[PDB]
Amino acid sequence: MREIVHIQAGQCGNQIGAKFWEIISDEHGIDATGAYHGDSDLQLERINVYYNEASGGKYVPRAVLVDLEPGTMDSVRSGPFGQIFRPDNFVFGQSGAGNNWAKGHYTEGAELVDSVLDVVRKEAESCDCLQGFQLTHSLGGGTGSGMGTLLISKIREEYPDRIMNTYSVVPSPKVSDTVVEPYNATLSVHQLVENTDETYCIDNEALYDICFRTLKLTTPTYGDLNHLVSLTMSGVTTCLRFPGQLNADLRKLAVNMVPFPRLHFFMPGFAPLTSRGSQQYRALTVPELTQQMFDAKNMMAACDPRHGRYLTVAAIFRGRMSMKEVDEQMLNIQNKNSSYFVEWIPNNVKTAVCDIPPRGLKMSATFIGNSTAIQELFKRISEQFTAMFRRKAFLHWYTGEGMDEMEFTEAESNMNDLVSEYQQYQ
Amino acid sequence: MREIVHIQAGQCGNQIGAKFWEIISDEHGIDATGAYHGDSDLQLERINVYYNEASGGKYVPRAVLVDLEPGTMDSVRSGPFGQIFRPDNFVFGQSGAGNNWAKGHYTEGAELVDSVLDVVRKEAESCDCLQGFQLTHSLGGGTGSGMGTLLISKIREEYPDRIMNTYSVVPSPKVSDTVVEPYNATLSVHQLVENTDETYCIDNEALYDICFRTLKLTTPTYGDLNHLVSLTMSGVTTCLRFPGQLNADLRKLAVNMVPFPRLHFFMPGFAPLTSRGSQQYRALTVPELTQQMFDAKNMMAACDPRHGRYLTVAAIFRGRMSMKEVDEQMLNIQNKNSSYFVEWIPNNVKTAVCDIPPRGLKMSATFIGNSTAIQELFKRISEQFTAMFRRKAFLHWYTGEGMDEMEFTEAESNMNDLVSEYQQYQ
Amino acid sequence: MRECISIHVGQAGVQIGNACWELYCLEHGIQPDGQMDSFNTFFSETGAGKHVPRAVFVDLEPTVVDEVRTGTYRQLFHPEQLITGKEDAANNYARGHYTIGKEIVDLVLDRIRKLADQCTGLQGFLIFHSFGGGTGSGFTSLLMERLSVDYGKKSKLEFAIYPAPQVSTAVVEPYNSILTTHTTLEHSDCAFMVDNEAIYDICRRNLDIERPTYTNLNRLIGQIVSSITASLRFDGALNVDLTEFQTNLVPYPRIHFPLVTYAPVISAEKAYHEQLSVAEITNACFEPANQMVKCDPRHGKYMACCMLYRGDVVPKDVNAAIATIKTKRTIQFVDWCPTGFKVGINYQPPTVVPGGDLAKVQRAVCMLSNTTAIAEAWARLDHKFDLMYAKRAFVHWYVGEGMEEGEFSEAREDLAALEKDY
Amino acid sequence: MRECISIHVGQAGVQIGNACWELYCLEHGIQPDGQMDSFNTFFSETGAGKHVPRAVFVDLEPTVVDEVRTGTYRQLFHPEQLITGKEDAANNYARGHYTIGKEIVDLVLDRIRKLADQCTGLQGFLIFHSFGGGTGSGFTSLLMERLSVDYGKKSKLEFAIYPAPQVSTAVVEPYNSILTTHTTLEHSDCAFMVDNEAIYDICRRNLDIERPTYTNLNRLIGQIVSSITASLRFDGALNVDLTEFQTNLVPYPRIHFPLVTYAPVISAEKAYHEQLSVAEITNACFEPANQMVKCDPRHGKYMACCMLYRGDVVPKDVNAAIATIKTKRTIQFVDWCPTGFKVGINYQPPTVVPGGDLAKVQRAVCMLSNTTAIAEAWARLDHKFDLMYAKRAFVHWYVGEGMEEGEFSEAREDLAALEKDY
Numbered sequence A, B: 001m002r003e004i005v006h007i008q009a010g011q012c013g014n015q016i017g018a019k020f021w022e023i024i025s026d027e028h029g030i031d032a033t034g035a036y037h038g039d040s041d042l043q044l045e046r047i048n049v050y051y052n053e054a055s056g057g058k059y060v061p062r063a064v065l066v067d068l069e070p071g072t073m074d075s076v077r078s079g080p081f082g083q084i085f086r087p088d089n090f091v092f093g094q095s096g097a098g099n100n101w102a103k104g105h106y107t108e109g110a111e112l113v114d115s116v117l118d119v120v121r122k123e124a125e126s127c128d129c130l131q132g133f134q135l136t137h138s139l140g141g142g143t144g145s146g147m148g149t150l151l152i153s154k155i156r157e158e159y160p161d162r163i164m165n166t167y168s169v170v171p172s173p174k175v176s177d178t179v180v181e182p183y184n185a186t187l188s189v190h191q192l193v194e195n196t197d198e199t200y201c202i203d204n205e206a207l208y209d210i211c212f213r214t215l216k217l218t219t220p221t222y223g224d225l226n227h228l229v230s231l232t233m234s235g236v237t238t239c240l241r242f243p244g245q246l247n248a249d250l251r252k253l254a255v256n257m258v259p260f261p262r263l264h265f266f267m268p269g270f271a272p273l274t275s276r277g278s279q280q281y282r283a284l285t286v287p288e289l290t291q292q293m294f295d296a297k298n299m300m301a302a303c304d305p306r307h308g309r310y311l312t313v314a315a316i317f318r319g320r321m322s323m324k325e326v327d328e329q330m331l332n333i334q335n336k337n338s339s340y341f342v343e344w345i346p347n348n349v350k351t352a353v354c355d356i357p358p359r360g361l362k363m364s365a366t367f368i369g370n371s372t373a374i375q376e377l378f379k380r381i382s383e384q385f386t387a388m389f390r391r392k393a394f395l396h397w398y399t400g401e402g403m404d405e406m407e408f409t410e411a412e413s414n415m416n417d418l419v420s421e422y423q424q425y426q
Numbered sequence C, D: 001m002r003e004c005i006s007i008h009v010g011q012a013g014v015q016i017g018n019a020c021w022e023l024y025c026l027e028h029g030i031q032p033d034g035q036m037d038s039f040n041t042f043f044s045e046t047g048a049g050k051h052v053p054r055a056v057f058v059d060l061e062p063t064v065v066d067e068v069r070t071g072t073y074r075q076l077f078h079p080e081q082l083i084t085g086k087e088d089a090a091n092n093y094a095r096g097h098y099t100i101g102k103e104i105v106d107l108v109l110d111r112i113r114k115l116a117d118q119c120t121g122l123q124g125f126l127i128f129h130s131f132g133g134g135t136g137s138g139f140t141s142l143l144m145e146r147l148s149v150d151y152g153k154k155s156k157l158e159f160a161i162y163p164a165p166q167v168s169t170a171v172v173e174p175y176n177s178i179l180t181t182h183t184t185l186e187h188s189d190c191a192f193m194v195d196n197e198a199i200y201d202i203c204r205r206n207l208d209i210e211r212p213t214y215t216n217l218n219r220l221i222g223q224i225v226s227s228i229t230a231s232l233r234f235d236g237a238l239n240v241d242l243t244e245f246q247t248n249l250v251p252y253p254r255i256h257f258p259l260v261t262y263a264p265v266i267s268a269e270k271a272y273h274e275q276l277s278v279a280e281i282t283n284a285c286f287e288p289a290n291q292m293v294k295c296d297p298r299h300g301k302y303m304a305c306c307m308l309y310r311g312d313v314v315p316k317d318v319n320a321a322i323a324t325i326k327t328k329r330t331i332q333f334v335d336w337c338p339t340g341f342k343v344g345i346n347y348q349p350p351t352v353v354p355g356g357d358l359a360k361v362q363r364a365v366c367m368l369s370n371t372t373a374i375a376e377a378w379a380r381l382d383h384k385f386d387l388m389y390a391k392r393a394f395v396h397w398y399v400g401e402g403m404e405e406g407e408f409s410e411a412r413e414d415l416a417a418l419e420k421d422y
C-alpha cells in the first residue's frame, strides 16, 4: 500500500540513498541481509511501503540506482548492506557527463532514459499502489541534475497525478566546486519549476556548520551529512510508515506547503541535535526543541529566514507527550515570532505527530517550513549566471551537446519571474 | 491416447529433442533408463502421449531421430538418457548435405525418405490415436530444412487431417553463419506455407540476448537455449499431458491461432525467467508475469511486436491461483496495450490453465502470441534473397542437384505475397 | 408418481450432472453405491434398496467420463449410461454437430427413449451443457431437435454455460454460440444463465472465498437445480410444475431466455453473522450484483418474476415482502404485463454438503425472471461476431466440416432479429 | 421497536464510531465476538446470541480501517461494513468531495439503504467526522446531501470535529471548514462542538491527567453520545426523541449548531472526593470552563437549555435546581425565548469502562444548548479565511480538482450572512 519508489542520481545521491536504506533497516528491524528481527509489530506492519515481498521471509528496498559511472556503484554495493539490493536495480553508464547538465541529459542520458523508465515502471507495476516518488541528486553536479530533470519530466508525462518530492542538493554559495555548476542549477531549476510538485532545498555549508558547531565535531565528514539526511528521511516518512494519533503522509504535507504551483521550494529541518555531554545535561522536553525549531544555527539551506518571511510551517513529532502542549507552544511561537512570520496566513503551523520515535531517540523533530529566504539564494544564482554568461565563457561544452542561446535566456527569465513572485509575496 | 510422434532434424534439432526428452523424464518422473519413479499419479496417468508401452515396467520416448551424419548421433546416444531410446529410432545418413537444401532434399534425402516414412508410419500404427506431430529443425541449416520440408510434405499427403506444429529455428539476422542459408530459409518457408498447419519461429539472437541479460549470464551456451526450448515444449504440451481446470490441446491452440491458412507463424513465449538473487527477492505473483508477458526483452523471435500489431494472444498457466485474476489482468493488458493490439479482434487473449506446475517451479507461463512483427523478418529475408540472387552467386551448388530459375522465382513470389498479406492485415 | 430425465453433454455438462446427482444423493441419503417415494423422480426402484440416476453422460472426449468412472460413485452410476467419445470437437460447433455427433446421436436418442419407456410420468427433460464447448454446443443442439421431433410438445429445460463477455476459453466462441442459438431457438423451451465471471465475483465478495474452484460453480448449478426441482421432489403449499415455468415466461416463443439467481450465498461464519428474513433476502437477491448474470437488469424492463421459497416461509410474509418490492421504483415492469408474479412454496429446507461453501440453512429463495438486460449481452455478442467474422476468420475450420459461409450469415441476421424483437 | 444508523467518515470518524460501539457493547455486556430488547436500537438479531453494529466505516485511507480490523473486535464487526479507500484527500475538501468521493459514495449510499431496509423503525442517522480532515469534510458533506435527497425529512444528527482556533492539523483547514459548512448548511439538522484544546485542558485540570491520549477524547465523544442516546436505548420518566431535539433548537433553519457539555468528568480518586447533587453538578456544568467549547457563552445570549439526566435523579430536585439556575444573572436568555427548557430523565446510570478516565457513577447530566458564543468562533474562522485567501493561497490545490475561485467566495459570503444573522 502507498508504495514509494526511490531513485538516486549522482555519487552523493547514491550515498544518501544507501545511508537512508541502512537507517530504514534500523527503524524497521531489518538486518544487513534483509531478514526481519524487529521486536514490535509496528516496524513490520507497514514494511511494504519501502520493501517488496521477497521469498524466504526477506525484504528488499524499493530503490533504483542510476549513475553514469560504476565507481560509486561498486563502493555502494561492496559497502554495508550491499546484499539487500538485487543486482538488477544497479544500472550504470560508462562515460560520465563530467559535471555537465547537457551531456548527462542528452548525450549519455539518451541511452539511460530507457533503462530508468523501464525500472521505474517495473517498480510501479509490481506494487499495489504507488503513492509517490522520492529522488535524491545534487544540483551542483552536472549528470545528477540531468537525471533528476529527465526523471521528473518522464514521471510528469507518465504519472501526472502521483505527487512526489525531490531532495536535490543545491551547490554551496561559498565554494565553487564546479565552474559550470551555475548552468547545472539553472537548468535543474528551470525543469523543477515545471516537472516537480514540491522540492526541498538542501545546501551544503549550512549542514557543514551544523556539524561543526551544533554537534561540536572538529572533523565533519560526508557520513554525518548522510546521517542527518537520513534523519530527515525518517522524519518526513514516519507518519506514513508508522501509526500515529495524527496520521499524515506526503500528500498532506504537499497540500499544506504549496500555495502556488511555482511556489514549491522548502527548506527541511531536524531536531534535537546534541552531543553526549550535552544530552545528559540538556532538557529532554518540548521547549528545548521549540527554541531549536526556529534558529539560524540549526538551519538547513543557507539563507536566513529572518531577513524574509515564513510562508507556513509544518512540524512532525515522534514521542510520548500531549498534544495541547504542542498547540500552546505553536501559539507562543506565533506570539513571539510574529514579525518573522506572515500576517496574512494565520495559524500557519502544520501540526502532526507520529507515535513511534526513531531508534535510539525517544524524540525526534523534523521542521518543514517555507520562507522567502530562498529568494536571496535564487537572486544570487541569477546574478552569477548573468555575470559569467555575459562573458560567454564555458558555453562551448554545452553548445556541443545541442544547446542554444535563447533557451538559457528563457531559463534565466523563468528564475527572474520566480524571484519576482517570491519578492511580491514578501 | 492422442499420441504425438517427435521427429528431429539436424544437429540442433537432435540436441533440442534430446533435452526435451530429459525434461519430460523429469516432469513425468522417469529416470535415465526409463523406469518410473514419480510421486504422483498425474505424471504417469498420461505417460502414453510421449511414451510407449514397454515391457518390464518401462517407458521409451515416442521419438524419431534423423540426420545425414552420425557424429551428433553418437554424442546424443552416448550422452545423458541415451539408453531410453531404442537403437531402431536412430537412422542416419553418411554423406551430409553440407548446409544445402537441395542436397538434403533430393540427393541424400532420396535414400532417407523411405526410412523416415517407415519409422513414422510404424510409430503411428503402433499407437492408439495419433493426435499430431511435432518437428524440430533449423532453417539456417541446409539438410535440416530439407528433412523438415520433406517430412511435412509426406505427412500432408499421408495424414491431411492430423494437425501439427513445426519448431523451426530461423537463422539469426545479425550473423550469417551460412552463405547459402537464405536459400535454405527461402525453400523451407516456401514449403511451410503449403505443408504445415502452424509454425513457431525461433530466432537465435533473441534467446541469446535473453540468456545474456534477463538470466544475467556472462557465458551463454547451447544448453540454456535447449533448456528454454524445453520449457516451451512443456508449456505448450502440459495442457494435453496434464489435467487442467481449463483443459486444452494443440488443436485448441491451432484453432485459436490460425485466421488464414497462409497466416500461421507465431512466436512462442516463456516466463518467469529470473536468477537466484532476484527470485528470492521478486514477487512470485501474476502481475510480475503479466509485466513479463508483453516485452521486447523476454521476447522470442527477433522482431519487435510494438512496430506491428498483435493478431491474437494465447496464455497458458500452471500453478495455484483463481481464474478471475487472470481474466482481469488480460482485460487490463488490453486496456493499456490497445495501440499495440488489434482493434478488430476483441478479447484476442486465449486463456487456459494447466493445474500441474513444472518440476522445480510453482508457476510457469508460456506466451503464445502472433503479431505482424514477423513481417519485418520476412521482408528482410526477401530483400536479402533478391540482393544475392541478382548476382547469381552460389547457384551452381543448387543447380547441380536439379534446381531451376523460375522455381526460386515463384518461391520469392510466394514470400512476397505472404508479406503483402501480412502488411494488409497490419 | 412421475420422473424426469437429465442430459449432460461436454465437460461442463458432465461435471454439472455429476454435481447435481451428488446433491440428489446426499439430500436423500444415498451412499455411493445406492442404498440407505418422491426420490423416484430421479431414481429407479429395482431389486433391493437400489437407486440409479436417470441420466446419460455423453461427451466427444472421454476424459470427463473417465474421471466420473474413477470416483467413489462408480457403483452409484450404471456403467452403460456413461458414453465415451473419441474425437472432441475442440470448441467447434460444426465438428460436434456433423462429424462426430451424427454417428453417436443414435445410441443416446435411442436409450433415453427407454429411459422414457420405464418413466411413464416423464415430466420433462433437463439439459446441461456449455455454449463455449464445441461438443456442448453442437451435440446438445442436435439432440435438442431430436428430442423435439421424437417427443413433440414434451417439456424440455436447458442449462447452458454461456461464455462471459470477457471470459472465453476459445476465441471461436462467438461462432459456436451464434450457431447453437440460431439452431435450437425454435425448440429451446427455456434456457438460463451461467456467467463464470459473475460466479467468481460473487464467491469472492459474498462467500469471501479468495481462492474458489469449479466445485463452487458445480453447486452453484447444483443449488439452482435443487431449488427449481424441490417442487417436483417435495410437496409444498403451492408446488410448481415444469409446464407452468414455460407457461408464465413464454407468452411469445421468441423470448424464452430467463436469468436465474440464488439467495443467499453465505458461508457458515457469515451465516452466524446473518439469519434470513423474507424482506432482506429478497431485496438482496433483486440487487443486480447479487445476480450471477453480468448484465444490469435496471437497463431495461422486467418481464415477470417467480419466487421459489423452500423451508419455513410464511405465505403472508411472502405477499407483504413482494408487495413492498413492487412499490419501490428500482423495479419496473412492462406496461402489458402488470401481474406476472408466481410464487412456489416448499417445506423442504435447502440441503448442505459437508465441506462446502454454502452454509446449512432451513430456508432459501430462488430468483427467477427474464430481464431485458439479456438483450445487452446478445447485442454485444452479435457485435463481436460481426467484428471477428467481418474479415472471415476461423471460417475455414467450419468449411472443412463441409459448409460455406451462408448459414453463418443468416444465423447472424436471425439473432439480430431476436435482439431487435425486444 | 426501532433502530438508528451511525456513520463514520475519516480517521476521527472511524475512531469515534469504534469508541461509541465499544461503549454500546460493554454497556450491554457484548463480548468481542457478539454474545452474552432496547439493545436492538443499534444491533440486529440473527441466528443465536448474535449482534452486529448498524454502522458503516468508510475512509479515503485504509490505515484506520486496517487498525479497526486488527483489534480483538474483528468478530464483533461484520467485515463488509468496513470500507477501505486508496487515495486520502489529505485535508482537501474538494479532493474527497469530487475526485475519490464520487466513485465510492455509491456502495455506501446503497448499503446503508439496506441498513434502513431491515430497520423499519429508523429513528435517524448519526454522523461522526472532522472538519479538518479532507475526507471527513468532503465525503461527509456529499453523503449528507445524499441522505437528504434519499430520505427527505428523516432526522439526521452530525458529530463534527471542528478544528480549534489555535489547534489545526492542517493550515488549509479554513478552506475545508468553510466549504463543508456552506455545502451542508441547508441539510445539517443539528451539528455539535468538539474542541480538542478544550478537551485537553479539561482533562488536565478536571481529571488531572497530565498526559492524556486520544482515548480520553474517544470516550469524551462516547459519553456524550451515550447520554444523548440513553433515552432511545433506555426508558425514563420523560424520554426524549431525536425529532424533539431539532424541534426545540431549530425554530429557524439557519441556526442549528448547538454546543454540548458533560457533567461530571471526575476520576475515581476525585470521585471519592465528590458525590453528585443536582444543584452543584448543574451549576458546575453551566460554568464556561467546564464546557468543552473554547467560547465563553456569557459573551452573547442563550438560545435554549436542555437537560439529560440519567440515573436516580428526582424531577422535583431538577425543577428546583433549574429554577435557581434561572434566577441568577450569570445566565441570560433572548427576549422572545423565555421558556426554552426541556428535561429528559432516564433511569439508566452512566456506564464505566475498565481502565478509563471517568469514574463509575450512578447519576449524570448532559449539558445541551446553542449559545451565541459560537458566532465568535465563526467570525474568527471567517476572518482567518479572509486573511489567508486574500492573497489566494493553496487555492491551486482545489483548482487542480477542477473549479475556479468563485464558489470559495460565495461560500465565504454565505457564512458571513450566517454570522450576521445572529
Ligand SMILES: Nc1nc2c(ncn2[C@@H]2O[C@H](COP(=O)(O)OP(=O)(O)OP(=O)(O)O)[C@@H](O)[C@H]2O)c(=O)[nH]1
Residues within 6 Å of the ligand: C010, C011, C012, C015, C060, C061, C088, C089, C090, C091, C092, C096, C130, C132, C133, C134, C135, C136, C161, C162, C163, C168, C169, C170, C194, C196, C214, C215, C217, C218
Ligand atoms: N461454470 C462452469 N463451466 C465449466 C466448467 N467446466 C467447463 N466449463 C465450461 O467449458 C468451457 C470449456 O470448453 P468445454 O465445454 O470443456 O469443451 P470440451 O468439453 O472440450 O468439448 P469440445 O470443445 O467440443 O472439445 C468453458 O468455457 C466453461 O464455460 C465448470 O466446472 N463450471
Ligand SMILES: Nc1nc2c(ncn2[C@@H]2O[C@H](COP(=O)(O)OP(=O)(O)OP(=O)(O)O)[C@@H](O)[C@H]2O)c(=O)[nH]1
Residues within 6 Å of the ligand: A245, A246, A247, D010, D011, D012, D015, D060, D061, D088, D089, D090, D091, D092, D096, D130, D132, D133, D134, D135, D136, D161, D162, D163, D168, D169, D170, D194, D196, D214, D215, D217, D218
Ligand atoms: N477529537 C479527536 N479528533 C481527532 C482524533 N483523531 C483524528 N482527529 C481529527 O482529525 C484531524 C486530522 O486529520 P484527519 O481527519 O485524520 O484527516 P484524514 O483522516 O487523513 O483524511 P484526509 O485529510 O482527507 O486525508 C485532526 O484535526 C483532528 O481534529 C481523535 O482521536 N480525537
Ligand SMILES: Nc1nc2c(ncn2[C@@H]2O[C@H](COP(=O)(O)OP(=O)(O)OP(O)(O)=S)[C@@H](O)[C@H]2O)c(=O)[nH]1
Residues within 6 Å of the ligand: A009, A010, A011, A012, A013, A015, A016, A068, A069, A096, A097, A098, A099, A100, A138, A140, A141, A142, A143, A144, A169, A171, A177, A204, A222, A223, A225, A226
Ligand atoms: N552531503 C553530501 N554531499 C556530497 C557527498 N558526495 C558529494 N557531495 C557533494 O556533491 C557535489 C558534487 O556532486 P556530484 O554528485 O559528485 O556531481 P556529479 O555530476 O555526479 O559528478 P560526476 O559523476 O559527473 S563525476 C560536491 O559539491 C560535494 O560536496 C556526500 O556524500 N554527502
Ligand SMILES: Nc1nc2c(ncn2[C@@H]2O[C@H](COP(=O)(O)OP(=O)(O)OP(O)(O)=S)[C@@H](O)[C@H]2O)c(=O)[nH]1
Residues within 6 Å of the ligand: B009, B010, B011, B012, B013, B015, B016, B068, B069, B096, B097, B098, B099, B100, B138, B140, B141, B142, B143, B144, B169, B171, B177, B204, B222, B223, B225, B226
Ligand atoms: N539453440 C541452439 N542452436 C543451435 C544448436 N546447435 C546448432 N545451432 C544453430 O543451428 C545453426 C546450424 O544449423 P545445423 O542444424 O547445425 O545445420 P545443418 O545443415 O544440420 O549442418 P550439417 O549437418 O549439414 S553439417 C547455427 O546457426 C547454430 O547457431 C543448439 O544446440 N542450440
